[PDB]
Amino acid sequence: HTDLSGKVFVFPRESVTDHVNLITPLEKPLQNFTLCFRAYSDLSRAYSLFSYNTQGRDNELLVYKERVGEYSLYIGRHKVTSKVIEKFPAPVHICVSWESSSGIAEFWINGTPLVKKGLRQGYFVEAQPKIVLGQEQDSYGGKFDRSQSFVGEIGDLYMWDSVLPPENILSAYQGTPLPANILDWQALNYEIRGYVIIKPLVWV
Amino acid sequence: HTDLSGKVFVFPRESVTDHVNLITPLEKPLQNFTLCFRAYSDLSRAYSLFSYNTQGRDNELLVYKERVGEYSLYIGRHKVTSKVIEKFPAPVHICVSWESSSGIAEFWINGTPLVKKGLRQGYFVEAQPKIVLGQEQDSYGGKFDRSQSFVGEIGDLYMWDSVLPPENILSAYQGTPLPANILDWQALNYEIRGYVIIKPLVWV
Amino acid sequence: HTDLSGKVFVFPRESVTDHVNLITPLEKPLQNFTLCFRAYSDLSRAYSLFSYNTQGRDNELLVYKERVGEYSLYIGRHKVTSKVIEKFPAPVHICVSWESSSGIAEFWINGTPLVKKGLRQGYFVEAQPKIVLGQEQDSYGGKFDRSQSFVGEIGDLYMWDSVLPPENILSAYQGTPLPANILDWQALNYEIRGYVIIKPLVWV
Amino acid sequence: HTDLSGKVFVFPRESVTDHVNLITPLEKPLQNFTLCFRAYSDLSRAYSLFSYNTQGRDNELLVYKERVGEYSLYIGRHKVTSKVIEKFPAPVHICVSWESSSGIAEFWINGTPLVKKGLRQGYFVEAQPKIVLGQEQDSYGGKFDRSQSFVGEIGDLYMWDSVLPPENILSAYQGTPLPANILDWQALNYEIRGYVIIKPLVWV
Amino acid sequence: HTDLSGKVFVFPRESVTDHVNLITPLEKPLQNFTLCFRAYSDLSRAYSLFSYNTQGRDNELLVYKERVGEYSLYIGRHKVTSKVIEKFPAPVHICVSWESSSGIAEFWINGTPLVKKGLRQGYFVEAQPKIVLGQEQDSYGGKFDRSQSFVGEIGDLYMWDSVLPPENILSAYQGTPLPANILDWQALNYEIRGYVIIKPLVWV
Ligand SMILES: C[C@]1(C(=O)O)OC[C@@H](OC(=O)NCCNC(=O)O[C@H]2CO[C@@](C)(C(=O)O)OC2)CO1
Ligand SMILES: C[C@]1(C(=O)O)OC[C@@H](OC(=O)NCCNC(=O)O[C@H]2CO[C@@](C)(C(=O)O)OC2)CO1
Ligand SMILES: C[C@]1(C(=O)O)OC[C@@H](OC(=O)NCCNC(=O)O[C@H]2CO[C@@](C)(C(=O)O)OC2)CO1
Ligand SMILES: C[C@]1(C(=O)O)OC[C@@H](OC(=O)NCCNC(=O)O[C@H]2CO[C@@](C)(C(=O)O)OC2)CO1
Ligand SMILES: C[C@]1(C(=O)O)OC[C@@H](OC(=O)NCCNC(=O)O[C@H]2CO[C@@](C)(C(=O)O)OC2)CO1
Ligand SMILES: [Ca+2]
Ligand SMILES: [Ca+2]
Ligand SMILES: [Ca+2]
Ligand SMILES: [Ca+2]
Ligand SMILES: [Ca+2]
Ligand SMILES: [Ca+2]
Ligand SMILES: [Ca+2]
Ligand SMILES: [Ca+2]
Ligand SMILES: [Ca+2]
């Protein structure tokens, strides 16, 4: 468990191999969540930002960037997509929440809410996941795809087991995130596989 | 009747069934009206914003968004269209008024007056309407069309039986609208059908 | 004659019929003139803004908008065209002057001088005109063309029998035009024909 | 000689005929020069701004505008071209210097230096020129080309027999140029031929 | 040899011959380095900014501009590319660092950090280089290519044998660079070959 404050994971190249495994202490199925992180990439093609798979379930929870200005959330294989005006290339802060009771998914880009969408109302995302950054999973922990690899820098990743109110989203965006009980950048259990470098964050 | 202050209807998905029925004691034929509301959608295709049909009368009163930067009003099946510069996607405040005696239709977009157009001078829009959000009607209450469905968020919807002067339009835009006697967001009678979720308004 | 201060003509629809006739007490041939007015239209196709014909003479004096960013003046069937950066759609203030002795035509868009052009040096534009707003004449008083009709709003129309200096152009733009002897918005002699509505000017 | 302070040459129409001859008593071949002037044109096609020909020598010194954002200097039939971001149409202040010893040509657009280019190092531009505004010469004083004619307004033209330092360039742009010894707007010997009109400068 | 403060190399024309050799007594293979310089060119095609070759080694260290908004670093024949929003044409300040131990390459454009990339981790860039400005080498000191030549102005060139922290990059951008131990603009050992002119820096 490492304090990565002020630091990013650099995925310096395209590969089918470089990734970071994220280990969460959570062992119960997810009804509600919020996921925030910072990314800086100049890929124009599609890539996975956050890949969460469970046994026999691809795309159980997936944050996927299809193209510039477009963000997709997959819950249990089902997908929503929301659009935003953004410059390319540019650093970005991304928060996404999802609520089982309503099905509502909320993207926040640089503290700006995108249009709400809804999917998988009543569903629970399964526990005991494999979580990977830098690659998209098609199996429980593997079956990566070069054309979906993340190339660039990721920092300030937090994941909470609740839907964060606007004020806590903005706080995360501004660099004072509330401590997070699923994944916390300041106490992160992770394994680097292949070519991933930890560097100071210089682009905020 | 519900006070919806600070809240929105979220139509979280494309469908042919998700809609809200708006209930009003409108018994007298309309010679004059103003309709104001806020909307936030990232659809690029055409969609109905506000659909009002009467017995044997399609498109009796319809606010229809043909494409980005173009707003159409239908009165008694007749149509006018006006253009504006806008960003996409972006939250928008829309006011539209119409006046029988001159036939003049006025769109106001984020407090900004569009070019006046005119239609159905001397006409009275029929009473006893079925008013629906989220779908466009082709019958008296039904005959919805998936390709015309509204996906996104609608809030702050008011409707008056008179033509609002510019200062009152601006008041609505700024969030202090005058009391409204046809539809009022702070005392709204409505029916949710299918997948519509009420959420706080976070994008104003 | 009417004081049209704070008011516009609204030509609410495309037609081959709707127009306003303007009556001048001029009688003398024009060697010098300035014409100023405001217009708000979201037409993209070409249209006539100000059509002045005499017996047996088409396009004796015509202000014609070919396309966005381009303004044409016709004097005695001859034309010049000048370009400008403008937003679309957008309210605009237009002044045009012409001086026989030099032939110089000056367009002023929102108090901004366009490139000077020149035509019909030594020519006298004929008196006893039919002057129309909303349609382009191909005869003396008629032969209108739907594809040249003006749809939108026109206000603050003044015409002088002299070439206004930049100061006077700016004054008119900023809302205090010098007293005008050919045509005067504050004492206008006009005939409405077909669908033209007088409304308060709300876009300035 | 005429003091043209506050005045421009207006070339109000395209032609193969309209031009201004500029007269200088220069008998000594040019080793160094700076040329500054103001131009306002809405031509999109190529045009000559300043044409300097000597006997049996085309394009001895030529300032030619190929298209928007690109300025060309010809010295002794050789060419350099430099690019700039500019709006269109827009008034522009242009300075260009050339230095034989280095061959360096410097364009300055609205007081902004363009990328330096180099041509004809060691060369002397020939004396006893015919200098024309409004047309491009292909002979000694004539052989004009309609498609190269300048339509628009030129003012504040000065030419020095030395390379001006940046400070004197900014001075020219700001409207306080140093006295010039080849050509001087405030003591200009010229011949108008065809349709060219002197008018006040209104666009600065 | 030679304080070039306040001065630039001007490469005034396209050629296969015009270049500047930069001489340094570097005998130790580089593990870490930072290179900073100022460039101003209106070339649209690809060109080499900084060409560093060793005996039998092409593209040992090379800064290459593929197209507008795209910067490439070659280390030992391998390359990375990073993208940026930039105006064209425009003066630019470029810093690039590379670090053997991590393989990380950092581009800084006008003091703005680009997305980090990585190449040749564990590699040492060879010493005893031929370093040239204005041309790209394919041999040890020669084999130039006209389609790769730099046309324009270069100044403020510094090279350090370490990775400069962001603060030091900004200092170089602001015009107060730290003394550099490989290449220093204020004490530069150079050889001008062909048409290269030293001029004052006027675009900073
Ligand atoms: C004939 C038919 C069909 O059965 O209808 O199958 C082939 C084809 O349909 C597909 O190929 N469907 C799957 C498309 N793949 C896709 O959308 O992948 C997305 C979601 O999954 C990820 C994120 C992934 O897990 O790698 O990649 C991007 C056309 O329709
Ligand atoms: C041959 C002919 C003709 O008879 O002239 O008929 C077929 C075709 O004409 C039409 O299809 N006309 C109706 C077009 N439909 C239309 O404009 O729908 C609009 C208005 O109504 C709504 C808003 C609607 O109520 O769904 O949808 C978009 C071409 O012309
Ligand atoms: C063969 C020939 C010729 O004789 O050269 O005649 C037919 C054709 O030339 C024309 O048709 N010329 C007249 C074009 N009409 C035109 O420019 O109308 C303009 C000006 O007048 C207005 C403003 C109008 O008054 O309606 O409409 C646009 C090609 O050349
Ligand atoms: C066969 C050959 C050749 O002999 O190499 O000559 C004909 C052709 O090359 C040219 O025609 N070159 C001259 C083209 N004209 C040109 O560049 O005009 C420029 C420069 O001169 C001015 C400024 C002018 O003086 O009119 O107009 C624009 C192809 O190459
Ligand atoms: C057949 C094959 C192959 O063997 O794979 O070689 C020929 C072709 O591949 C190339 O030609 N590759 C090299 C192309 N040149 C290139 O990428 O130049 C870059 C890098 O080198 C510089 C900087 C240079 O040193 O000139 O120019 C730009 C297709 O693939
Ligand atoms: Ca997958
Ligand atoms: Ca995959
Ligand atoms: Ca309908
Ligand atoms: Ca329908
Ligand atoms: Ca006509
Ligand atoms: Ca006509
Ligand atoms: Ca010539
Ligand atoms: Ca020529
Ligand atoms: Ca090479």
Ligand SMILES: [Ca+2]
């Ligand atoms: Ca090469």
